[model samples]
Target: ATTYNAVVSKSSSDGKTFKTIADAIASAPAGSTPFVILIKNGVYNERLTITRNNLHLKGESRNGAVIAAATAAGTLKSDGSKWGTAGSSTITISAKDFSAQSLTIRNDFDFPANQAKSDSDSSKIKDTQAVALYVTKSGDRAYFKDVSLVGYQDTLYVSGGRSFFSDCRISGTVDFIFGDGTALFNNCDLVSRYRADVKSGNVSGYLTAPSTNINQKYGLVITNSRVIRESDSVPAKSYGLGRPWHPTTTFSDGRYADPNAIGQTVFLNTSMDNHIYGWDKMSGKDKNGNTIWFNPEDSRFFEYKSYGAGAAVSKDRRQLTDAQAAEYTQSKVLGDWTPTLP
Candidate 1:
């Protein structure tokens, strides 16, 4: 049996408790027994990093418990460097055997406001990606359930781990759910938000920018999910389901993309909105005025039994046959590790 070792509440009337998630996590010692932290209902405005193993972070209510932050890629650190997409994330998980549920984690960087402004520097404005949640670390087993990850670009970054997300909502814009990980999103909502200020002919959004390692069998597997646009104002065919991100040192001086990361993703039994095009070559323009390109056919991007206006179109969408789909089961992706929700 598991017990909550700590409680976090914003109000003092909640009895003895830590005021923030960070404080509670800091107090809990690492041990084989899970250090369970229960968060009460309220919006906690702070960035959080959880490095403790066997930790379970839970909330009182799915809708009321919120952890919010506002940091974009353009945001400068004390060391005078850009935060980048991963650093801009509101929550970063680097521990193994971790679980979080019944909460909303958000990066509230205002992309629409940034796009609407003209006085901002071009370099900074172009890198206005914000991340809500980032899960990384080798041999990690992380699970998230009944949670909401809200943000704009690069909303959820799952890399270098074996992660499972169930009955969750992830809302974002460009390359939202991305990274190099054996991740399974089951029965989740993949919501696409729009930037009205984006210039015409430019891509409205990209759902994923997977950088699966070359030898990794499973990259990102989204099963029994629904891809829905936030509003109807988003033009049709403006969004891409995903694109292969092959990191190259030549691209942006390797500031964003890594040369070692190949991309792989599959959609199984998922619903999609009409705005989702099949895929793209990813936006990897170089400083020498050259476009970094990769063969999309070479990448392992597939869709299995995808339905809706975006499914089985004459476009570049590839379907996974029954024989091929058998290889992408969750058990195969997780490799003998089964996650049970509390």
Candidate 2:
């Protein structure tokens, strides 16, 4: 067991403390071995990464266990540079079997109100990819409870694994919760930080998933979660239900082209606003020149008891029957490997 308290000034520096954590992990090992890292509250001005397996990271409290950075990633200009994209991130985890609770992870990257910059300034658009937390690799189980992930874009990347997020506060603009992780988000608070241009005719973009492999058992499942706007007065714009992330790109008429990544998404028992588009419509043109495919008959999309302005079902929307939804439950999705969330 390991405990970290940043406020006590008892915590070691990034390199020193990290070595301490790793040494402990090396001693105990991952899975069934039961290793725990307890972190106390107070903002940490550094970058953290964990490549160890079977690790437990718990905070003293949400605000108390603060892991954050004030500058963007690239600004650091140091080694392991390619590890994280855009600006330097707050935390990066590449191992498996990890769990965290009651913590606040932030990039601290921000744009001033009405602040504008030239598109040439990569700092404006490029730096926004800074991540508060990044997890990659497989055979991993993750749980984040009462945690706060705050950033502008690409805030939380659940890359390459099966993970669960419950009761977390995630805020971002583009590809916020992106990646190929077979993730299940239950009862989470997801609020968009920016407003959409509804009149542009183009949808604001996908709320739940921007991309997902079709063959994977899961992609992004927002169950009983809330899709809310940061500002109520902001006008809601049309956005995609989800864009394909497999062999078939959403921009092209690829119909689950890859046998491996078909059936990417299942938005069960969720709620959304008018910002959600085509409750059951899929975009893109096929090889034969056909541009439309219905969700119900497609065997690709699933929605059960989903409530909200966007839940309206028409010829454009397809809903899953009770039987279909039952088949997609968590137990059915991951079977015996599924981890229990507290």
Candidate 3:
């Protein structure tokens, strides 16, 4: 039997303890014991931040219990400053030993409306990097199961540390699952959304954009998973698997592509939709204002035993040998954190 420390419900006569998820979290006992909060079926349109450890967020129903928001990277903060991509997440968790299950988190940031701005000569592409869930560096040993993360761009931000997600669905368009963290996704669904520009023969979206540290052997590893398309509207071979991201870092002179970012994303025993392509290139400026191109051949991205309409053997798509594949086990990537816990 599972006992919840708090219960959240919107119904006035449902006999729940708290009316809001935030209030339940606020009233949680301050101790080392794991606290579970069960949320009833409802649409909770609020931006949340969890700063404590040993917290579990569970939902009564997976699709029925949703945490939704529309705040984008350009959204203003209380101090009038931009929220930025990291700050635009619907739920931000910044502590270790966190877990969530049977819920949906989304960022309905009006992607189509912001994408239309490219037509105007006076406007550039709006900063629309809205995130559904953000696990910061301190938020290690995090586990997720039976959860759905929905967004358009930059949906799941695994900022740093370690995370394990099983039986989860992450849907988005451009670099949706990205970060500098070490994350292993098992038996999950990675869905790519439709884009009008891509259907018209324009290059735009990628599934992942990782900026992993050079010292970390693991970046993003997906095993026994599926890379699917949102619908038939998405064009064939328009969306790519991933690209290496070298976020700006302070150097002796200024910040540019951080040399420490040696991103690595791997897929093992995974299936892909016909719309998925191989790895692609990314660009950044050097400290001296020089262009630095990161080609797929140079990064540490790989796949093994990937079969589907979208899968193919190519020079651009690297593959790991049987010996190399042995290193990508869940224990190796997660580092002693048992994912089958509270």
Candidate 4:
């Protein structure tokens, strides 16, 4: 049996220790030892910023415990300006050795209400990119299992570090799983939630947007996972696999595309659906206000033995050689550190 340092319950009448997850995390000692906490079944409506290292959270159940918020990029802050995408997250992890399991983190930003209808949808709300989870660059060795990340745009952001997600369900409509990090998703469900053509754009949605560094051997690697849609109503050929996100870089002179943002992602033994077409390109801006294109061919994006409705060896869907496929195992992607549940 495992002993938790604290228990979080929304009810005040109960004998549980804390009413909020943030308070439970704050009860941890200022040390490097593991501070484990168990979250009870309830809908927690508070934004969290985990600053304690070696902090872990285990929920009663994945579906029963939900941490929900509705902040978006355009949401107002204390200073009255917009919160922006980086600031509009339900949970932001800022410490090292953070882990969570059996819970759902959601940013219910009313995506459909703000969804654009056309190329020039003026009536739609601007800057609706809400993030469910945001892991900072300092949050290294992060692990998650049996967790659900629900949002619309930019759901999960892995800023940096080596993270491992096992058997997690991530649902989003646009560039949901993004950032420049080394991550491995094993036997997880990657759900595209856009059921129409104009939810975000004509392409329906893109699953990932990784801005991986050039020197890293791996960016985002998914093994034995399934690429699915919200439901059958989502049309076929309405989505794409992913795209290389050459995020803007702030140079001393001006902001431009970072040449070092050579993102690399691959799927091995994936169960792909017929809903996806293939990889696509993302546009960036140069200092001179010209449109710069980042093609999938230029970056490292591939699939290996993807057997399903969308399986094939073609120019659009690139396949890795059998020898190269051997290099993308979970062990290699996670390196030496092995994450275990408490």
Candidate 5:
């Protein structure tokens, strides 16, 4: 039996007053009971962690409430190592049955400088994947609406979860939405923010890097979403729908690119900008100096009914047939669990 008795607030007004979001979550009642936290409209710059189950973190409005942090991958620590992906995220949600609405979570990292430093430390840098919101841990069921995840690389990390995002905006640069979760982004905006500093002739960015386990049937699915590139300077065919983050020895951080992570993603009814490429192999050599190969032909990357300048019916773009598309309904992807919306 879940009770809505516990109500916390973070603002100037009266109620269960808390200085930080973490403080509110820490004080929340433990159990399957739902605890709701009401955050007022303002920018609260802090690194947040929610470990309790069944939390409803609601904000006043979509553009009003904002949780942000300035940590980037290139931001060195006392040990001289970078923040990396897990450490650089603004918010990390580990609890199950978590829901949030009308809020923006951001990692305001210096994108241009971070990528530049990664280029310099390409040999030693493990991962320059800065993240905005990371949903980690098993038994995870997260639902978000009218939310915004903003960052540079690896903006939204759904490491382990069954999650859903509706009417949300996820803004990032390279490999922004990478993870191993079974999730869906419905009616959302996938915004690509291209910085002017990237001069390497390489393609501008990648939308996703799904490291889904071999057992999971679904990884990341975006239905009725819009992929918009923010920069006018970014040339056509500069971005990709995704590339497989295949498992390897050196890059195997256990949770990110394990040997079992084959990576799967599907984009159905998605509107793309001219900056998008159909697919990318993301192939490379292993730590043992062995050449690794990954092709879209071998994996479960697909698109159906994609429109706009980037969505040409080409051999590079794998399209799901009508029967295949019928299998990708929200009910089939989410299973028995249905998200409770605001």
Candidate 6:
């Protein structure tokens, strides 16, 4: 059984005020038995780094436990160069076999500072890059259940390996759930915080850009998920479900069948909010300043039993047959090593 430890109280029932998540994780010795760090009901406003494996950070409850920060971009470049691209993030997980539940992980990047008239608009979220859960190096046996990742542009970064999310809630704008992992989001709520303005003079992008690499079985398989625009949000909002982001662009070239991008994505049973673009809708001058539509028949889009304000059938959307969806169930995706409390 997984024993419990409160971050505030190492072993006390009355102690409630204590250490940061990052401090507790750093203090734990390597090869220690996996413990359930029960974070109390409060906002842990620090960046958490999971450099060791088997550290399960469980919260008291989702609404009560909030892990948030007020920045997203970074000041450092990809090659470790200082460029002031830093945005304070709430947490960073770089270890394998991590499991989190019932918590709200957020990157509340100083939106106003980002919107302020500064010489550096490159760090702004919509124009720049920000994330809530930035999993860059580890995720071989990771599992997230009933968690909420809130942000814009780049909210959740599932970068590597076989991760699983059951009943998780992901909300954002512009390629929010974009990642390079073979993640299986089952029965999760994919709420769009704002309506997509793809046709209203808005150069808006898609919900995902599956950059699946060569021979990857699954980039992102969202099964039995619901895509909703909350609030008194607009109806019939336009948005592209996904665009391929590989050496061979799947969204720009009308090719979900690229060998390098196979098992890229399948929106098996999801409700839509608009007439989603089935294929790449890149209608701009290429890198060489050339105009192109780059498509002949963009008809590989699939859907099944999807119903909502935007779940309409057309040449752009096709209902998946029953037999097809059955083949992509939880067992099919996670295989024999499903989540089991040992």
Q: Who wins the lDDT comparison?
A: 3
Which residue ranges in model 1 land beyond 4 Å of their true spot? Answer: 120-124, 199-201, 249-260, 283-290
lDDT of 1 by residue, 105-191 (tens): 999888888887776556336788898999976438899999999998889999898999999999988889888888899999999
Q: Comparing 1 and 2 by TM-score, which wins?
A: 1
Candidates 4 and 5, the one with greater TM-score: 4
lDDT of 3: 0.87
State each model's CA lDDT, in order: 0.84, 0.61, 0.87, 0.86, 0.80, 0.63
1-342 per-residue lDDT for model 3 (tens digits): 888999988887878578888998988888657989999999988889888789999998889989899888988879978889998999998988999999999998888777766666343346889999999998998888999999989999997889988999999999998998998999999999888645447555898988998788899999999999888988888887888899988988898998668788999999998888788888888788789988767778899989899887566687899989999999888887887656
Clash-forming residue pairs, model 3: none
Residue-level lDDT of model 6, residues 1-342, one tens digit each, is 557654643234546635677766666667746756777767777667676777787777877788887554653547964422223345666777788888889877654355554566555444445677766556576788888887766677676677787888887666677656777887888765553333454434456656566456567778778776554443344456665543334456553333343225667767666534343443333444455443313323356676666665566555568898786787877776586432
Give candidate 4 regions above 4 Å deviation: 116-124, 196-201
TM-score of each predicted structure versus truth? 0.92, 0.73, 0.96, 0.95, 0.88, 0.79
Model 2 spans with C-alpha error above 4 angstroms: 1-32, 70-89, 111-115, 119-127, 196-205, 246-263, 279-299, 338-342
Which candidate model has the greater lDDT, 1 or 6? Answer: 1
The C-alpha RMSD in Å for every predicted model, in order, reads 2.9, 5.8, 1.8, 2.3, 3.7, 5.3
Model 3: lowest-lDDT 10 consecutive positions: 116-125
If the candidates were sorted by their TM-score against the true structure, best first, what order would they fall in?
3, 4, 1, 5, 6, 2
RMSD of 5: 3.7
Q: Could you tell which candidate, 2 or 5, scores higher by TM-score? A: 5
Of candidates 6 and 3, the better by TM-score: 3
Whose TM-score is higher: candidate 1's or candidate 5's?
A: 1
lDDT comparison, 1 vs 2, better candidate = 1
Best-matching candidate per TM-score: 3
What overall lDDT, based on C-alpha atoms, would model 5 receive against the true structure? 0.80
